[PDB]
Amino acid sequence: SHMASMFYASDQLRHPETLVIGLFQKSTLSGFTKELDDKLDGHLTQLLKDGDVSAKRNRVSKVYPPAATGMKRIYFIGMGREADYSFEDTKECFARVFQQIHQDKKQEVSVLLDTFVSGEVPAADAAHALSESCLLAVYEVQDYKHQELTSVCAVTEEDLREVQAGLNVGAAYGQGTNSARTLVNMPGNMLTATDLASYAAELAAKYDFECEILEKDEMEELGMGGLLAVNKGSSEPPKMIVLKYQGKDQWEDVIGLVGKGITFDTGGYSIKPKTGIVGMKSDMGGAASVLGAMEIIGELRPEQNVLAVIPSTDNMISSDAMKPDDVIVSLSGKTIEILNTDAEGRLVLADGITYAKQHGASVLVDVATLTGGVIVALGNEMTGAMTNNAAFYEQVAESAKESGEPIWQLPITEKDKKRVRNSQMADLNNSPGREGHAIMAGTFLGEFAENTPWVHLDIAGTATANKATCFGPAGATGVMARTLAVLTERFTPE
């Protein structure tokens, strides 16, 4: 059927109307750029000389050549010094330049990929940078208010099957990210647990994954007390969304990914302040992460098994909502005292984690926008991590190093498990205080993890951003979707 892709590798500059060219801080031109300079009677040299065009990293200069040439626009993007130039410099160079092209409302673009390759960054890599960074930079918030770029040609003298391969993975990663951004940016009345369950089903159909969606009654029968406690105040029914992707002949070494899917967090009876409750549609950020990553896995079909489990519900006030001091029986059969109804996320994750384990997960990663504390500990741009297994954590850390999404581990100590076990009435205390706030939530989850190698990721700070950047709009960031995807590529068992 020969379907056209947005990103296309060619050896020819068929579409020279709109160009994108990287410039190093060499002090001579070469390759295409030199030919262009000559083709332009030395104008590009003059512009560099006068500083109208700059090779300083992330400077973007737009030149409009004479119509005589076949070119209307050139977007020059500075790359700094070639000795310092790395892959993630490439990502940022593409992001900066497509920010500008997205503003300019251009439809077709020819990138001279080779102007971006170097010792450190080969063609296939530059290609990955381009599609991923392009997709992230040009993303638009799906709004409900009362132009699109649809062709990017990567023009290169290198193996087209390889370059195209880079463009394809780049594009998969960006697509899953943007998917997650979408789910996250959606107003809570537009995305209930029910809507989240349709999305998952559509995804399951599209990529032929096994999908099961447990409803309240099956949850009652199975004893899912965590997820049912949070849902008690809701009229919107709950969902436990399960997705199976078996990409190995044997259902074994299964990677369990658990996402917090709280579709709106009011904080419940332990009520949240007037400023704190705005933006709490984004409390399903963790679910976005895993769904985003399923999309990526569905596109790249790696040789790995993955169980995705997403407990999903809103957290509301009513005549029947959970109350502070309630004691509950989790799925695992552990009892939990609810000291704080705003610590609802770890209740649902606890059931999610025990379910994943019950369904053959042999390693776990949970992703949750879980605590304000993580923001205090690490800021808005560094996701917090906790683990019960250094070896598995190394795999997750390395994934994040490849992803480019920064992670930092916080300790779980014996003293920490002491605090979480400190409840007068139950096995576990859902909220011991602000002291090591993020670690308390990690520590609680790890009790449900028991012996299964596990990593918890708190994306309360990294799941959203106040301001636009080169890599996308204000609002949801789709953080972690990449890192989970990469983890499933790179994961090898014990």
Ligand code: NI
């Ligand atoms: Ni063409």
Ligand SMILES: [Zn+2]
């Ligand atoms: Zn909460």
Ligand SMILES: [Zn+2]
């Ligand atoms: Zn929450």
